[PDB]
Design a protein around this ligand. Structure first.
Ligand SMILES: [Cl-]
Ligand SMILES: [Cl-]
Ligand SMILES: [Cl-]
Ligand SMILES: [Cl-]
Ligand SMILES: [Cl-]
Ligand SMILES: [Cl-]
Ligand SMILES: [Fe+3]
Ligand SMILES: [Fe+3]
Ligand SMILES: [Fe+3]
Ligand SMILES: [Fe+3]
Ligand SMILES: [Fe+3]
Ligand SMILES: [Fe+3]
Ligand SMILES: [Fe+3]
Ligand SMILES: [Fe+3]
Ligand SMILES: [Fe+3]
Ligand SMILES: [Fe+3]
Ligand SMILES: [Fe+3]
Ligand SMILES: [Fe+3]
Ligand SMILES: [Fe+3]
Ligand SMILES: [Fe+3]
Ligand SMILES: [Fe+3]
Ligand SMILES: [Fe+3]
Ligand SMILES: [Mg+2]
Ligand SMILES: [Mg+2]
Ligand SMILES: [Mg+2]
Ligand SMILES: [Mg+2]
Ligand SMILES: [Mg+2]
Ligand SMILES: [Mg+2]
Ligand SMILES: [Mg+2]
Ligand SMILES: [Mg+2]
Ligand SMILES: [Mg+2]
Lengths: 170, 170, 170, 170
């Protein structure tokens, strides 16, 4: 048993390992989306920059969960990072990102339920302090972006996506 | 009844008084450990500095609980600060510190369970915000220190403890 | 056909996609190695920092190949990032890193042979300018590290790994 | 024979003279395009500035080849700079520029093949270091510009070209 382990259920340790994989998966999805906008036949540099920043943020989220695992005396178990499942347009990518962030949020809420069921207040506070509000903010931002693109006439209006790239993501 | 008291159970007030005593006790243990390393026949100045800093931190932890008691309308009840129970070597002191920090953590987790049972979210947040992660970080650090000292050959190798004092605690 | 594509063989495009996966795999291996040294029962913070830096560098190597694919009019095709195959000690991790960097180098040399066979001087120069010397430098550094750890008495001497962490990786 | 000439085939010298003429021709094409956008009946100042910058860059490319000829002991032989062959719109000019840059790239790749066939590694490195990636970058940029203008509704939308002038070329 780890000399540091205290009040850390094996189920919580396993759930943290699963969450690490999901954060890495999200980083990979955003990496894919970024380079789609870097294609010569899409060419929206600010969409590309936005999604690359989001990819790097997800890698940081994964590293912080890996640090947590070690802080609590758990053992990191890594699995394959699946390739992104399925970008068409700026609007479609924003919609896919909104769906991804809501999926990650659901996983974090399930993790919090488990921590609450196992009476682990440190883990509850960790999730609340570093992940829950970040998710709410990401989801709101992506919703705002989807709304604007739709109102502007995307995805049929290439002018809409061009101007959004310059004015909102620039 | 205090004019400020609201949602503060008498059991929580008593448990906060007990936690104040434990924090003061921990300060005293670290004070004892510090001056052991200041002895001419031990002479590890960075072990001494490290434990003195830890003593002062525990006094701050106690003062913040005393402030909380007053903030919530409870009344501070102080008890004797027992002398430290039982330092031999740098490794042994680090091991004793790890055991102490795990004991304090267990007390804080019991305090949190009580606050949760009495539906006191302010007290839950106080413990989570100012105490739980500090404990996890302290325990991880001490575990790291114990591991290094053991791998280096302590406590039989006086060279190990000398070099750890200079490179890790310096 | 991409409007920008010129002198870019389909085989070169496919080989670039394979190299992107390998760079991402190498990033994942180094990420795993980093957090192993962050464990409370290993506790070598500079080994952890060194391998994390190496992980981030490999992600940059992958992103530059993704940019190249788009620059030349190729299409990025991503595959799963396999979990690291198999850390025991600082020496063992350094030895595994040396083997990984030599494997990546071999892949880059095969990529260069293909570019040379397809008369693609831009791709040859890209590989030579951004990848070949970086690989030679990484391999030399890791060889130097392995040599020092072995001469110091690793992996049996925990003192050797402790001092290398402080003096070479610090 | 030049006192400095070494490993410099007469065919390579002649091919360098041809490349000097092409670079000067490209400078002239971009000069023509620039002043078209300066017309009162076109009036896109940033298209004009963009193409003038490109003209000056091509003159620098020619001067560097003239310096190379002298460095290697060859003799510069100049020919007439033909007037630009054939601007209608911002999109059409960008499309013509993309075609020109791909033509120049093809000439550079043929020059590299000759240098490789004559075992002239200095000339190969010169072309790779100062010309090949510059061409790939120019072609990608122009492709990106063409894509954006088309998606925005050019050349029928004068608003598209106006906004591209301000947001992308400004
Ligand atoms: Cl436990
Ligand atoms: Cl504006
Ligand atoms: Cl009350
Ligand atoms: Cl091609
Ligand atoms: Cl030393
Ligand atoms: Cl010669
Ligand atoms: Fe995000
Ligand atoms: Fe995340
Ligand atoms: Fe999607
Ligand atoms: Fe909290
Ligand atoms: Fe402390
Ligand atoms: Fe304390
Ligand atoms: Fe003790
Ligand atoms: Fe809270
Ligand atoms: Fe590296
Ligand atoms: Fe690499
Ligand atoms: Fe290995
Ligand atoms: Fe080269
Ligand atoms: Fe140019
Ligand atoms: Fe040129
Ligand atoms: Fe033309
Ligand atoms: Fe070269
Ligand atoms: Mg699959
Ligand atoms: Mg917060
Ligand atoms: Mg007594
Ligand atoms: Mg906190
Ligand atoms: Mg497998
Ligand atoms: Mg070559
Ligand atoms: Mg170089
Ligand atoms: Mg004529
Ligand atoms: Mg270069």
């Amino acid at each position: 048993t780890s000399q540091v382990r205290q009040n850390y259920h094996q189920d919580s340790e396993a759930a943290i390992n699963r969450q690490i994989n999901l954060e890495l998966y999200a980083s990979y999805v955003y990496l894919s989306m970024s380079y789609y906008f870097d294609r010569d036949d899409v060419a929206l540099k600010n969409f590309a920059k936005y999604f690359l920043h989001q990819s790097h943020e997800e890698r940081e989220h994964a590293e912080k969960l890996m640090k947590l695992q070690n802080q609590r005396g758990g053992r990191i178990f890594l699995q394959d990072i699946k390739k992104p499942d399925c970008w068409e347009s700026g609007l479609n990518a924003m919609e896919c990102a909104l769906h991804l962030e809501k999926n990650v949020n659901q996983s974090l809420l399930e993790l919090h339920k488990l921590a609450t069921d196992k009476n682990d207040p440190h883990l509850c506070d960790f999730i609340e302090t570093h992940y829950l509000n970040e998710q709410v903010k990401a989801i709101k931002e992506l919703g705002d972006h989807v709304t604007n693109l739709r109102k502007m006439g995307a995805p049929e209006s290439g002018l809409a996506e061009y101007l959004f790239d310059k004015h909102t993501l620039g």
